[PDB]
Amino acid sequence: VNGAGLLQTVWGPVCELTSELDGQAGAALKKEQEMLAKINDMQMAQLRAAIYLAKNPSTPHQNALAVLTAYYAERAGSGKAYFLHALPKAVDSIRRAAYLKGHLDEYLNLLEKSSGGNNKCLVTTDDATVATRGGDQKLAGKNCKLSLSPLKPVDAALTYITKAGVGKLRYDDGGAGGNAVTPSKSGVHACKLLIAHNTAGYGDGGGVTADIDVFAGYMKVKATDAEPKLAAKSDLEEGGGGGAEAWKALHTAIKQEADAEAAELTNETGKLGERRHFLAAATNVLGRAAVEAAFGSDSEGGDRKIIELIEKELIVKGTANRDADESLGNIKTLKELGELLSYFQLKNSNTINELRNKLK
Amino acid sequence: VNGAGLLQTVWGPVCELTSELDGQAGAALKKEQEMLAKINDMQMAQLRAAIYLAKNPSTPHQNALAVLTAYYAERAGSGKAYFLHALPKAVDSIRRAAYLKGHLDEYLNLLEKSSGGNNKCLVTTDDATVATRGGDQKLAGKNCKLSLSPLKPVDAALTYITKAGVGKLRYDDGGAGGNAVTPSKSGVHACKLLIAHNTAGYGDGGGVTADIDVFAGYMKVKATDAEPKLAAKSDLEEGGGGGAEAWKALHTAIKQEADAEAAELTNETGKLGERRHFLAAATNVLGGRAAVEAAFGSDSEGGDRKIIELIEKELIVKGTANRDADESLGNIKTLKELGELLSYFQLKNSNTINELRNKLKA
Ligand SMILES: *[C@@H]1O[C@H](CO)[C@@H](O[C@@H]2O[C@H](CO)[C@@H](O[C@@H]3O[C@H](CO[C@H]4O[C@H](CO)[C@@H](O)[C@H](O)[C@@H]4O)[C@@H](O)[C@H](O[C@H]4O[C@H](CO)[C@@H](O)[C@H](O)[C@@H]4O[C@H]4O[C@H](CO)[C@@H](O)[C@H](O)[C@@H]4O)[C@@H]3O)[C@H](O)[C@H]2NC(C)=O)[C@H](O)[C@H]1NC(C)=O
């Protein structure tokens, strides 16, 4: 018999999903912050190499330093372009996930609170057992957080919707008299919200004009005397039919998320002669032979020696009006690094003019 | 008499608001993109001034170039820090705005589609006139887009919720038998969804346990024989009471939105000797106001315009850093290209220094 509440095998998974959506924005924020940290790491590595070269013009490693500054600049530009390419996709995943969560929280809340006396709209396995909150704020043992927690950059698993599509939900069933999604109405227990018709639902004198999409289209409330009908799995996924656009758009948004470990953001690692962007830098500022001669190595790590020299270079108190000695590898603001490059570039200009005056 | 649909003076404004929320993400995207563009412009201006000094060691503007490079570096760091501080606020505004829109669209759709025969849940001015979609997809003359448009970085006004709070909605009314939010039920026309009670609503045998927040708390569906109760304006804003957290949290996020033309992102203006970060740059790389005036040869508001124009108009000939064509330095606008030019000329400086020292060797 029609007219009872919604079985937990249906809404339970929806509760778990909306609870996962709560943390999607914080996970995306964390990924954006980590991407920006890599780009800034490249930009600062460029300046440190440039500072070391300006500080030690007569260094025997000028060719290696010229290659490294040009390489880190390309890495900074390539990382910056990848971030701009990923930014619309990140925004939309935040937008689409929270929009779906708002749909689910509105209707889940309405059903959960439509409880009292005969009214039992979220039930477990039968018409008489209504869901209640436990001390741990679980709803009949399920996570069901129907609001947004404060934004925090921490990862949060999203397992009910992935690049592969939706999972762990019920599909297809209902839409008639089989009591597949609601238990048989055995007596006084009822939930008139789940049918848009007058016999066992909230319709007055008859049904509405046509079935109604709820849960952003995951479920249809019928305009006839019939229990709700669950959408097909493919209706919730990219390429599916109509009726659940918010689900498909979120799947698509998740499919198109950028890779946080993309090659465009990360230092190149191969043998120095195989490193494509090392070679391009050497080609433009000084190919293979030039790279390997500047670093005195064909190995995978022939750059570690000059890299360590840059990091450990001592910047004495008073250099660029600095208040204490520090290692160049620990200076990590653009203001400080830019002032050091300017200080040494100015010194070099005065060295050039003085030597040229002596020679003339 | 209780039991009719919802008056358009209530849902009309909610339809207009949810239509505005559709474009919030794109406006936020546009602002972030424009902010990143300013930061990148500072970084590239630093590189051009540094390239010009390296290319022209014998310039008479060496002190001015050292000041500008250090200044543009401070600007790039100051803009980057401002963007990183604004990024959580941007994410939350996107998250909170779309989350509220999802709430409003779910319930609006349910009421709009609960139409047919006696069922009339969104009405205009009386119990018998149900709202319908026109040719332009307006709902009884109102914009009511219950879905998200494709994301576009385009301006989109959000006027119903601002830094000052919410506006243009009805507040306070309802919660009993006065028919302030529903018209009096004259006959067969009905909407049982709007009261969680059995006399004129969808309750079975009695009311539910407690009033129910709908429209994310903008309105309460009553557990007693009573029409819905609209929240007070202050309950929808930062610092308000309970019942509409999704509204207060969106107001807060909007209050904390970043300024796209913030001082931290833009060039300093005015007399050179009064530009705080020009003065700080000069102090640190030269060892204040007097050093700045001497470097640029002026105290006017536009004392830096002469060296800035020299940088922009400097010719970079084909073959410099393996470049394939002549170009003005002010038109070179990638970090790869500018970084290869600075590297090329820094190397030239090293070789110029070594050659001069060997020539001069005693
Ligand atoms: C592409 O490749 C370049 C070159 O490798 C790289 O640039 C380098 O970036 C790092 C920053 O990412 C620069 O700074 C180094 O950063 C590490 C990590 O710092 C973080 O983590 C530590 C530990 O939790 C925190 O304390 C710190 O706050 C940060 O969160 C630091 O550990 C480094 O400090 C060491 O080196 C200093 C300079 O010599 C030392 O004085 C300091 O004590 C540390 O000593 C290290 O080396 C010692 C000698 O072997 C060893 O005994 C110690 O145990 C320790 O290992 C340093 O601050 C670094 O300067 C950059 N290098 C150059 C040449 O620019 C880019 O990051 C990379 N790009 C990407 C995107 O990955």
Numbering used by the authors:
A (entry chain B): 29 to 314, 325 to 398
B (entry chain A): 29 to 315, 325 to 399
The authors write:
We also crystallized mVSG531, predicted to be of the Class A2 group, determining its structure to 1.95Å resolution. Consistent with bioinformatic analyses, mVSG531 is very similar to the structures of other Class A2 members solved from BSF VSGs, particularly VSG1 and VSG2, aligning to each with a RMSD of 2.1Å over 354 residues and 2.4Å over 347 residues, respectively. In fact, with 35% sequence identity, the structure of VSG1 is similar enough to mVSG531 that we were able to use it to phase the diffraction data through molecular replacement. Most of the divergence between VSG531 and VSG1/VSG2 occurs in the top lobes, with the bottom lobe showing higher conservation, and the three-helix bundle the most conserved region of the molecule (RMSD close to 1Å). The positions of the two cysteine disulfides bonds in the top lobe of the N-terminal domain closely overlap with several of those in structures of bloodstream Class A2 members, although this does not hold for all Class A members, such as A3 member VSG13 and Class A1 mVSG397 and VSGsur. (B) N-linked glycan is attached at Asn295 at the dimer’s bottom lobe (salmon pink spheres). Two disulfide bonds are observed at the top lobe of each molecule (green spheres).
During infection of mammalian hosts, African trypanosomes thwart immunity using antigenic variation of the dense Variant Surface Glycoprotein (VSG) coat, accessing a large repertoire of several thousand genes and pseudogenes, and switching to antigenically distinct copies. In the salivary glands of the fly, the pathogen adopts the metacyclic form and expresses a limited repertoire of VSG genes specific to that developmental stage. We present here three novel metacyclic form VSG N-terminal domain crystal structures (mVSG397, mVSG531, and mVSG1954) and show that they mirror closely in architecture, oligomerization, and surface diversity the known classes of bloodstream form VSGs. The VSG protein can be roughly divided into three functional units: the signal peptide for delivery to the cell surface (and which is cleaved during translocation), a large N-terminal domain (NTD) that forms the bulk of the molecule, and the smaller C-terminal domain (CTD) that is tethered to the NTD by a flexible linker that can often be removed by endogenous and exogenous proteases.
